Design a binder for this molecule. Structure first.
Ligand SMILES: [Mg+2]
Ligand SMILES: [Mg+2]
Ligand SMILES: [Mg+2]
Ligand SMILES: [Mg+2]
Ligand SMILES: [Mg+2]
Ligand SMILES: [Mg+2]
Ligand SMILES: [Mg+2]
Ligand SMILES: [Mg+2]
Ligand SMILES: [Mg+2]
Ligand SMILES: [Mg+2]
Ligand SMILES: [Mg+2]
Ligand SMILES: [Mg+2]
Ligand SMILES: [Mg+2]
Ligand SMILES: [Mg+2]
Ligand SMILES: [Mg+2]
Ligand SMILES: [Mg+2]
Ligand SMILES: [Mg+2]
Ligand SMILES: [Mg+2]
Ligand SMILES: [Mg+2]
Ligand SMILES: [Mg+2]
Ligand SMILES: [Mg+2]
Ligand SMILES: [Mg+2]
Ligand SMILES: [Mg+2]
Ligand SMILES: [Mg+2]
Ligand SMILES: [Mg+2]
Ligand SMILES: [Mg+2]
Ligand SMILES: [Mg+2]
Ligand SMILES: [Mg+2]
Ligand SMILES: [Mg+2]
Ligand SMILES: [Mg+2]
Ligand SMILES: [Mg+2]
Ligand SMILES: [Mg+2]
Ligand SMILES: [Mg+2]
Ligand SMILES: [Mg+2]
Ligand SMILES: [Mg+2]
Ligand SMILES: [Mg+2]
Ligand SMILES: [Mg+2]
Ligand SMILES: [Mg+2]
Ligand SMILES: [Mg+2]
Ligand SMILES: [Mg+2]
Ligand SMILES: [Mg+2]
Ligand SMILES: [Mg+2]
Ligand SMILES: [Mg+2]
Ligand SMILES: [Mg+2]
Ligand SMILES: [Mg+2]
Ligand SMILES: [Mg+2]
Ligand SMILES: [Mg+2]
Ligand SMILES: [Mg+2]
Lengths: 77, 41
RNA sequence: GCUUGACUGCGAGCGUGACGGCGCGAGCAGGUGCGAAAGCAGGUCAUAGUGAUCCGGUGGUUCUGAAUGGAAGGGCCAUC
RNA sequence: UGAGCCUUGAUGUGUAGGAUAGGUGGGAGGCUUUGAAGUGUGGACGCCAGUCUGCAUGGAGCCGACCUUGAAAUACCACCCUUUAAUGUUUGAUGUUCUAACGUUGACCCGUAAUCCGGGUUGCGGACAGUGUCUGGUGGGUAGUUUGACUGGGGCGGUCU
RNA sequence: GUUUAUUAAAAACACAGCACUGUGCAAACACGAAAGUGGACGUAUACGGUGUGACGCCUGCCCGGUGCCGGAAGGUUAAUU
RNA sequence: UUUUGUAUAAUGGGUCAGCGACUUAUAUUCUGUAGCAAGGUUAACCGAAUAGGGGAGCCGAAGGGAAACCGAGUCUUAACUGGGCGUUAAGUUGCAGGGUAUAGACCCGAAACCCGGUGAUCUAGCCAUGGGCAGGUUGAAGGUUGGGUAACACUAACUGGAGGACCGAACCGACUAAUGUUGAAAAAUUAGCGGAUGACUUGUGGCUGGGGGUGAAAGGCCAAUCAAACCGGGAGAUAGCU
RNA sequence: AGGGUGACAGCCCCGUACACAAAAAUGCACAUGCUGUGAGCUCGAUGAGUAGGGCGGGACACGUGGUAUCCUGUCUGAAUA
RNA sequence: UAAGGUGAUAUGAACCGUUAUAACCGGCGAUUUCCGAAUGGGGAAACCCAGUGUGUUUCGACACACUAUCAUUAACUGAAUCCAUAGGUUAAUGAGGCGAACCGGGGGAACUGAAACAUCUAAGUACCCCGAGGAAAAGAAAUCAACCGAGAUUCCCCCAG
C-alpha cells in the first residue's frame, strides 16, 4: 500500500473545507517514490518505496542504518 | 548537502575536502561511483 | 441684524403600545446665543423621510487585562 | 540573459552662459620629476556644444574663480541618479548538450516447464514525463438543498414598512 | 427486425447509408482510490462519440449570443518570495 | 370523532373475550405538608451497611455597577432638587403534587435518507458449448454449350441454388374480438393474427449489482417488488398532520 | 429458610442450623531447592529529520478567531543543558 | 455412595446386583467415524482422488503414519555473472479458526434539531476493519500552580450548565 518503507508514513484522512466551510472527506497521501538505493556494504542496489522525507532521512542517517532498522522491524526489502 | 571528495572531479572539486553539492547530485552520482562520501566525520 | 439651544448630564408626570419600542414634557445642573428687559432657545407649524440583534471598523476610556509589568483582546462612551 | 558587487565614464546647457551647471569644492589651489596644446585605437554621450579616455612628435603649462550665471566651475576633492564596461560575483529565466535519478506496455539472458513479476545486459527517452502537498480555472459528471406570504380555490396579476 | 413481462407494437427504437468530430498506439474513451482490463493480440480503408436515417434531386443566408478550435501582444489575475 | 353547525346521505366500529395510550430518570420553579431555623443540608465514600461518620460543596442571610470598586447603599454625572436598582418576613432539606427542560417523552402511522450485506434459478445484455426449424414455391450470382465480338460487350437454352426471399406446421411472439374480471389463471382460454435459415430460437454453465448493472430506449427489466431491488441496522428517523 | 407428602406439618420425608469429609487433580497465600534471570557503589552519558516554522487538516469545551497547547500530509529545520 | 438398577416419550422383553469390580456421583486416563481453520490435492460440507515410507504378502490386496500455507531460524544447495545474491529442498518452533459484552486503534454516515438550510448539531454515535487481555488503555511530569505550593496514571462526587 501507499506506505513509506523507511518512515512508515501512510495516508491520513482530513477534510476539504471550502470557502463556505463545507467539509468533505479527503485523503492526504505521502509523497512516495520507488527509488533504487545503492549500498556499499553489499555492492548492490536496494529498491525501496520511500517518500521524500524518507529520502532525507536516508541521507541524514545512512542506507545501512535504515536497512538495519527495516530488518529489525521485520519488513522484507 | 556536504560531501567529502575522494577524487578530482573536473567539474568543481579536488580530493579530500568537504564541499557543498546538490543533494540529488551527491545521492545519485558522487556517492554511487566512489568520488565522494558524506560529511559525517 | 446677530448668531449655534440642530447644546452636555438628568427629568417630576403623562400618552401609546403584547413586548421590543415610540412620543410629549415643565423643572434641575453646567455652559452658551439673541434681547434694554420680561423672556425665548436642547432643531424645522405637527403628523412620513426608515430597520432590532449579531459580527465587525474608527476615536476616546488605563474599567478589565488569566504568574508578575505591559500589550493583544474584551468592556463602557461617541460613531460607521 | 535580467536585481545588487574596484562603476574608475557614470550625463546632466528652464534663464543666461569662452565655457553642455543638483549641491556639499578639501571654497580656492591643484599643478610641475607618472611628463603640461597634431591623442599614431576612437567614440560613449552626441540637443552634436564639446565632458572625452594606453596613443605625450611637444617631456612641464593649459590653466581657478576673475567677465557674463538663480550657484560658480566636480583644479590628486568621499552618497553624481529611469544607459552600459564593471574582476566577475552571488542569482531567476530561457535555450542547447549530457547521464547518473526516473520512465520504458523495445530486445535478449536468468528464477523457469511461466508473453505475471523480479534480477542482469543492452537500446531509447531523460531531468522531461509521472506522482505527493499547496494553488488558480473549468466542472449538473456527481451530491446536499432553496425556490415567501396574502389570495373570495390555486396560478397569473397586484400588494408586503 | 426491436419495444413499455402484466391497459400503449406505433408514425416510436434500430437499421444499412451520410456527415461532423476525437484518436499516432502505453491511442482516444470506459471500468477501476491503484495494479490492471476492455478498446485490440486491432492501428487512421482502424476505433470512440454525436446527429440524420435506404434510394433520387438537394441541403440557401447568418459566427452577433452560447459553445469549440487557434492566437499571443496588452489589462486583470493564485500559491510562493 | 370533527366541527359555525350532524339523524345526517361526514368519519370509525360485524359481535364478544383478552391486550391497548400522559410513564421513567435527572435538574429547575410554585403549592401542600414535616423537621430544623439565620441558619438548612449533605454528595461520593468509610461503615457490625436504611444507623453513625463524612460540611468537600450547595442554597440563604446584601445590594449597586459593564467593571475596577463601593457597601445599606450603590450607579449615572463635574454634581444631583434627581432618577434606576436596592434597604423593615425566612430560609433550607425531605416527602407528595401542579408546570418547565433534556431525553423515543401520551400511543399508533409515513413517503423518504444513510450504513453493511443477499440476490442475474425470473428478466436485460454478453461469453462458452450443444440442439431445433414438417412441407411446398420463387428463382440471383456463377458455369456450360451455342449466336455474336477484332477481343470483349451483349444475347438464347441448359444448368445453378442465392436470399435479414415467399406460403405454411413445430418453435417463438401477442394485433383484434368475446369470455373471465372474489377468474380454471395475481395476464390466461376460444376464434382469428405476425415471424418461421435468421438482427432467429432454445438447453446447460458462467459473467455484470444498486446511484450500480443491462437496455434495437419503454424510465424498460434487475426473483408476481423498480424515477433507484430486497434483508438487517441507525430507528421508537421526523410528522406544526390524522 | 425452602420443597414435597391425598386440605395449611418446626417434630412424615428431603433438607436446614451446626459438625465433619478427598485416593486423584487442581486455583490461591506463603515457604524451601533449582534454572537464565540481577542489586549496590564511583564516574559519564543524558533520546536530531527532533523541537520550532511555512502551507492544508484534525483533536483539544475552544467553529481561525487576538488563539495558546497536541497530532500530523507536504516543504524546511535548531540549541543540545 | 449403595439395595437397587439397565436415560426419556415408553409400557414391555432379557437380564444384572444385594454388602459390595450392579447402578449412580466425582478425579484422572482410554477410545473419540466424517465435515468443519481442515491443513496431502480437489470439492456442489459431511464427498472424490492420491504420493511417500514402514509393516503384513499366495499376484488380488490390507493396515499405520506423514504429506497445506505464512512467518522465524538453521542446514544443504543454487541463476543470469567470477565470487555472491535471488531462488530451491529438508528440519525445528509459532500462527491461522471460533466466541456475549467490555477495551485500543484504522475509517466513518445520514435521518433528526436548527421550527426551511448550507456553518453547526445528530456524532466521532450507528456501522465496517484490525489487535489484545482478563481486564485493556493511560501512567512516573519538558505537568499544574502562582511566586504559597502541589507532585505518575485511572475512577466517583462537587466545581458547574
Ligand atoms: Mg457533515
Ligand atoms: Mg412641515
Ligand atoms: Mg498578564
Ligand atoms: Mg486595550
Ligand atoms: Mg441537483
Ligand atoms: Mg438534510
Ligand atoms: Mg399560498
Ligand atoms: Mg405572482
Ligand atoms: Mg403492454
Ligand atoms: Mg398490446
Ligand atoms: Mg430520427
Ligand atoms: Mg443548414
Ligand atoms: Mg461565435
Ligand atoms: Mg467572432
Ligand atoms: Mg481560447
Ligand atoms: Mg364544514
Ligand atoms: Mg338535529
Ligand atoms: Mg341511512
Ligand atoms: Mg354515518
Ligand atoms: Mg371516529
Ligand atoms: Mg365501517
Ligand atoms: Mg411533573
Ligand atoms: Mg415519536
Ligand atoms: Mg451474484
Ligand atoms: Mg425443406
Ligand atoms: Mg424469410
Ligand atoms: Mg416481446
Ligand atoms: Mg391462439
Ligand atoms: Mg401461425
Ligand atoms: Mg412477411
Ligand atoms: Mg410464414
Ligand atoms: Mg446459442
Ligand atoms: Mg445499499
Ligand atoms: Mg416518458
Ligand atoms: Mg418484477
Ligand atoms: Mg434515493
Ligand atoms: Mg437517531
Ligand atoms: Mg429500523
Ligand atoms: Mg415511527
Ligand atoms: Mg383440595
Ligand atoms: Mg511541528
Ligand atoms: Mg515539522
Ligand atoms: Mg504555531
Ligand atoms: Mg484433505
Ligand atoms: Mg483444501
Ligand atoms: Mg445533515
Ligand atoms: Mg430542521
Ligand atoms: Mg420542523
Amino acid at each position: 500500500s501507499r506506505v513509506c518503507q523507511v518512515t512508515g508514513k501512510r495516508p491520513v484522512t482530513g477534510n476539504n473545507r471550502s470557502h463556505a466551510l463545507n467539509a468533505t472527506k479527503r485523503r492526504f497521501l505521502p509523497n512516495l517514490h520507488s527509488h533504487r538505493f545503492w549500498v556499499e556494504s553489499e555492492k548492490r542496489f536496494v529498491t525501496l518505496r520511500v517518500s521524500a522525507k524518507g529520502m532525507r532521512v536516508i541521507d541524514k542517517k545512512g542506507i545501512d542504518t535504515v536497512l538495519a532498522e527495516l530488518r529489525a522491524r521485520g519488513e522484507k526489502y | 548537502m556536504q560531501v567529502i571528495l575522494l577524487d578530482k572531479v573536473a567539474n568543481l572539486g579536488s580530493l579530500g575536502d568537504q564541499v557543498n553539492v546538490k543533494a540529488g547530485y551527491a545521492r545519485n552520482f558522487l556517492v554511487p561511483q566512489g568520488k565522494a562520501v558524506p560529511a559525517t566525520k
